[PDB]
Write a protein that binds this ligand. Structure first.
Ligand SMILES: CC(C)(COP(=O)(O)OP(=O)(O)OC[C@H]1O[C@@H](n2cnc3c(N)ncnc32)[C@H](O)[C@@H]1OP(=O)(O)O)[C@@H](O)C(=O)NCCC(=O)NCCS[C@](C)(O)CC(=O)O
Ligand SMILES: O=C([O-])C(=O)[O-]
Ligand SMILES: [Co+2]
Length: 483
């Protein structure tokens, strides 16, 4: 039993959160120091960036954020709470860059901070433990009036979005055990600093998923200089930018890199429209795909078939089969399990479920994971394997020389190892692209923000080794895939 781990550090969806910026803007400073039109302008800019309106009742911990006009949260405090509340608090504070100590306490290890918790969280605390709320207030958590909150929804203070940060995370993820690194770039050109009197500076920006050629011209040679073994897997997705679905840009990063003596080893390829139930998908038309295949074959790049849906299973195993065989064996597949998908009827325009794990069953799996019992967990595993099994069998039957991996969205990654071994898969993918958390038994609630994709790689490797599995390295993977 040999598996290879894929690291996916960036992706399309999550965003970077600067743990040192303000996370609360009181309405009084905003309305107080701007004309109604520029006040409405900033407020609109903040909402776009994910800031949300909150009433009075929040608590703010501010230290050293002086704009004139305890960094501890101990385990016994979290232990006073239900597991759900403790988890909300731990996730919120680790999103803000607090860490879990070896004793299971939360700790902020810097001298300045501006960290806010919403009225709904505080009300929940007041109801479970008035003594805790008093303890927080004694530690310097102060009552707030209405204003604006940066939740950090799908955010992480460890998300790499620049060539330097991405190179570094790629290197750490490889040294932690990953053989393949799947990459995205982000467009950071719309970043503005908004200055608010009494508060300081808040930076806004979309961090939009986008193929950025200059970023790759930097990242690709930078990675290969330090870790020439790296098997780079470049995203060709235009999620977010659905107008670019036919564009040459979706293969322009897949070139021979002079500094490196090679084209990227791997690139994603989805042989059908990808229509997220959550919204924001992108087309992959037959004429576009023909051009992608011609190009991969020319520059020596192996497609990774992204199995988002049944349309793709069907297309890959019939029409595109010979093209996939031509681009090199083994043929590579990634099961995008747990992400709900539509298929659209082109004649009527109606959509129907086309997910690998049927939405109803995925919904059932998600509720089982929230019972958080071993019994429920077994059930969840059963259900996932049951949905995915025929897909895996179909792929195996059509491509006897193939490697299949699996990913799962954050709150489902507890299933990864069991499902992958249960299905006989060849590899597992983890990373901030898919999930932002790790389990940590030391802390109440047992869940916190991952310190990076490297950490998730390290945990999955560890769990795999204790199942007796063997982990392949990048050199082994490269040799055994002929890439
Ligand atoms: C967006 C992202 C990556 C966020 O991940 P996250 O870990 O935050 O999970 P999420 O479900 O969004 O969390 C929502 C709320 O639940 C809480 N929470 C998270 N984990 C929890 C846990 N273990 N226990 C209890 N609670 C947990 C969070 O705190 C959060 O709280 P709120 O409800 O108050 O906000 C994730 O959501 C996502 O979208 N994953 C899917 C990624 C994906 O689509 N990957 C496919 C890529 S395909 C490919 C290969 O890249 C193709 C190509 O590139 O061309
Ligand atoms: O990576 C993804 O989920 C995408 O952009 O298709
Ligand atoms: Co991706």
């Amino acid at each position: 039993t040999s598996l290879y781990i894929t690291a996916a550090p960036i992706g399309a969806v999550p965003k970077f959160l600067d743990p040192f910026e303000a996370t609360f803007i009181p309405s009084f400073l905003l309305e107080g120091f701007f004309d109604a039109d520029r006040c409405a302008s900033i407020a609109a800019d903040l909402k776009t960036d994910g800031w949300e309106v909150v009433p009075a009742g929040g608590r703010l911990l501010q230290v050293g954020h002086a704009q004139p006009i305890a960094a501890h949260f101990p385990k016994p405090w979290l232990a006073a709470l239900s597991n759900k509340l403790a988890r909300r608090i731990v996730l919120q504070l680790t999103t803000y860059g607090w860490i879990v100590s070896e004793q299971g306490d939360l700790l902020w290890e810097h001298e300045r901070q501006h960290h806010y918790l919403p009225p709904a969280l505080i009300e929940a605390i007041e109801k479970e433990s008035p003594a805790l709320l008093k303890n927080m207030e004694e530690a310097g958590w102060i009552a707030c009036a209405a204003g604006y909150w940066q939740a950090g929804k799908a955010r992480s203070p460890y998300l790499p979005i620049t060539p330097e940060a991405i190179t570094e995370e790629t290197i750490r993820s490889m040294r932690a055990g990953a053989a393949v690194v799947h990459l995205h770039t982000r467009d950071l050109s719309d970043r503005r600093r908004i200055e608010i009197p009494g508060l300081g500076v808040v930076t806004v920006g979309s961090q939009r998923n986008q193929i950025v050629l200059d970023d790759y011209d930097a990242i690709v040679p930078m990675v290969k200089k330090r870790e020439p073994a790296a098997i780079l897997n470049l995203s060709t997705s235009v999620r977010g930018d659905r107008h670019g679905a036919r564009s040459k840009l979706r293969r322009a990063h897949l070139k021979f890199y002079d500094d490196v003596g090679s084209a990227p080893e791997v690139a994603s390829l989805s042989p059908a429209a990808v229509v997220f139930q959550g919204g924001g998908g992108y087309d992959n038309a037959p004429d576009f795909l023909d051009a992608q295949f011609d190009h991969f074959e020319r520059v020596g790049t192996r497609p990774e078939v992204e199995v988002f849906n049944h349309a793709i299973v069907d297309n890959a195993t019939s029409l595109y089969r010979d093209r996939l065989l031509r681009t090199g064996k083994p043929v590579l597949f990634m099961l995008v399990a747990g992400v709900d998908q539509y298929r659209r009827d082109p004649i009527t325009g109606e959509v129907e479920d086309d997910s690998l794990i049927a939405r109803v069953v995925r919904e059932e799996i998600s509720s089982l994971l929230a019972d958080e019992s071993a019994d429920s967990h077994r059930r969840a595993v059963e259900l996932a394997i049951g949905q995915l099994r025929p897909v895996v069998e179909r792929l195996r039957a059509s491509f006897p020389v193939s490697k299949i991996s699996i990913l799962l969205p954050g709150p489902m990654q507890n299933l990864l190892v069991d499902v992958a071994l249960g299905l006989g898969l060849d590899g597992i993918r983890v990373g901030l692209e898919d999930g932002l958390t790790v389990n940590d038994a030391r802390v109440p609630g047992g869940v916190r923000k991952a310190r990076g994709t490297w950490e998730q790689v390290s945990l999955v490797r560890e769990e795999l080794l204790g199942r007796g599995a063997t982990i392949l390295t990048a050199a082994q993977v490269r040799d055994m895939f002929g890439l």
